[PDB]
């Protein structure tokens, strides 16, 4: 969990 | 304006 | 969100849209596993509402979203509607979400977990962008 395949960009 |  | 920014599509894969039968988005939620969604008790979810997973752009007919039916609503019996305290509901899906690049779970903290004031966190959603 908590580990997206597509990384968020902040 | 709160709900009741 | 007021003054947020558009997210990279699929980057917050646990985020779901709670919609009524007419497709109207009324609340968000988070997948905590393939069969369960956590949302707010005040959202007033019923088993006639739909869990939409995998969505980014609600105006697109070409995204591969997952429309999932709700089996049962579990409103925490400590929820106090007068104070809005213990605002939590769990939704058990009748159809398990299919986890993929764009659909996956968020982690839960330990009851003893510490998140200090000043810590930078993130919130996501399709709520109003202006008032």
């Amino acid at each position: 969990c908590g580990v997206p395949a597509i990384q968020p960009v902040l | 304006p709160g709900a009741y | 969100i007021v003054n947020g920014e558009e997210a990279v599509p699929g980057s917050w894969p646990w985020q779901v849209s709670l919609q009524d039968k007419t497709g109207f988005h009324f609340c968000g939620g988070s997948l905590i596993n393939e069969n369960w969604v956590v949302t707010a008790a005040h959202c007033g979810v019923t088993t006639s509402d739909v869990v939409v997973a995998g969505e980014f752009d609600q105006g697109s007919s070409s995204e591969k979203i997952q429309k999932l039916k709700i089996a049962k609503v579990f409103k925490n019996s400590k929820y106090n509607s007068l104070t809005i305290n213990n605002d939590i509901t769990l939704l058990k899906l009748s159809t398990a979400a299919s986890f993929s690049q764009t659909v996956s779970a968020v982690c839960l903290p330990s009851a003893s977990d510490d998140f200090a004031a000043g810590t930078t966190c993130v919130t996501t959603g399709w709520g109003l962008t202006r008032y």
Partner: protein, 95 residues
Amino acid sequence: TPDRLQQASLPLLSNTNCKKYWGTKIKDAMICAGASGVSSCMGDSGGPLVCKKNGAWTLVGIVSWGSSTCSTSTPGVYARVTALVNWVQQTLAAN
């Protein structure tokens, strides 16, 4: 409501400092965040407030309530997940 998914970074506040805005409306199963130039708003309820802990995003808050005008100068209120995780675990287990 916007068609596309929005996001915002915002800081956690202390319940004590949150009380400076909301007073006694602030209870223990709640956590505030924001007052930082951003705000959760109508239609965001029920969605996540996530914090990265040991490289993984963790659910710390559930969008709950806040300013009637989504004021960016006032903190938003979230259900505090550490106070409710026990209940989640029991429900998932019994069902």
